[PDB]
Design a protein around this ligand. Structure first.
Ligand SMILES: CCNC(=O)Nc1ccc(S(N)(=O)=O)cc1
Ligand SMILES: [Zn+2]
Length: 257
């Protein structure tokens, strides 16, 4: 239905999802001269159990790496949160060339891709489906990915893609701790926002890392070689899946640093 093509993409999502033009939409451009340092922000604490890794899925516009979320084996705490948030997925966004592909920008600078590590509030809610539409329901860590040296931490993820080439394919994806993908510094920006694609719920507290991680030109190429079609149809590579930045509408981006 929705996608990233000219007909079904970001500038058209508002026709079926009017919250696309809301006051808490993501991503945003982080202007560093407008951020406010908040003394009350605690360090980010991630503690993930590799045994929670479950499955990798070609979802047509992207691929998702899902985690078992029946208990608190894998949690995010700290930062702006009083509640524990339970890991459920990570995924990436990328663009059609190295020049763009991140969702968030910093001082107008576009990176080549972005990693999202997503969690839901298990202190207040009983399931992702309950949490996903609540203002305090989701927490996503975003990592900007700067084109440069090959990142060996991506190897297991990239090696898995050949088994999920076309839409709907899925495979087991086990024994992996995604905190290995995060940068050395967890210094961060935070702001209240949204899912960056439909259904665009304004339910996400964003944690954007100040430090980038690397990716090579060829690693990006592997993401863009995934196919959005189902097996047996004409091949339609997944060339891009990044939303443009959206107006802050008077929100404050807080800095931990
Ligand atoms: C509500 C269903 N969302 C889901 O399964 N994964 C998801 C999709 C998008 C985002 S995002 N791009 O981090 O806003 C975070 C998580
Ligand atoms: Zn995302």
């Amino acid at each position: 239905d929705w996608g990233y093509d000219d007909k079904n993409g970001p500038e058209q999502w508002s026709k079926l999802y009017p919250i696309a033009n809301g006051n808490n939409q993501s991503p945003v451009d982080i202007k560093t001269s407008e951020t406010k340092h908040d003394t009350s922000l605690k360090p980010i604490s991630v503690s993930y159990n590799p045994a929670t890794a479950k499955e990798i899925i070609n979802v047509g516009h992207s691929f998702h790496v899902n985690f078992e979320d029946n208990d608190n084996r894998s949690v995010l705490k700290g930062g702006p949160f009083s509640d524990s948030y339970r890991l459920f997925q990570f995924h990436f966004h990328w663009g059609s060339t190295n020049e763009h592909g991140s969702e968030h920008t910093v001082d107008g600078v576009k990176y080549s891709a972005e990693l999202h590590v997503a969690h839901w509030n298990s202190a207040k809610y009983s399931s992702l489906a309950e949490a996903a539409s609540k203002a305090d329901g989701l927490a996503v860590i975003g990592v900007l990915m700067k084109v440069g040296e090959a990142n060996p931490k991506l190897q297991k993820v990239l090696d898995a893609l050949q088994a999920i080439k076309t839409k709907g394919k899925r495979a087991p994806f086990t024994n992996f701790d995604p905190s290995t993908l995060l940068p050395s510094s967890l210094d961060f920006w935070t702001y209240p926002g949204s899912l960056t694609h439909p259904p665009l719920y304004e339910s996400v507290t964003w944690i954007i890392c100040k430090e980038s991680i690397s990716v090579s030109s060829e690693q990006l190429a592997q993401f863009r070689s995934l196919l959005s079609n189902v097996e047996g149809d004409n091949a339609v590579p997944m060339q891009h899946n990044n939303r443009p930045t959206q107006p802050l509408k008077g929100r404050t981006v807080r800095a931990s640093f």
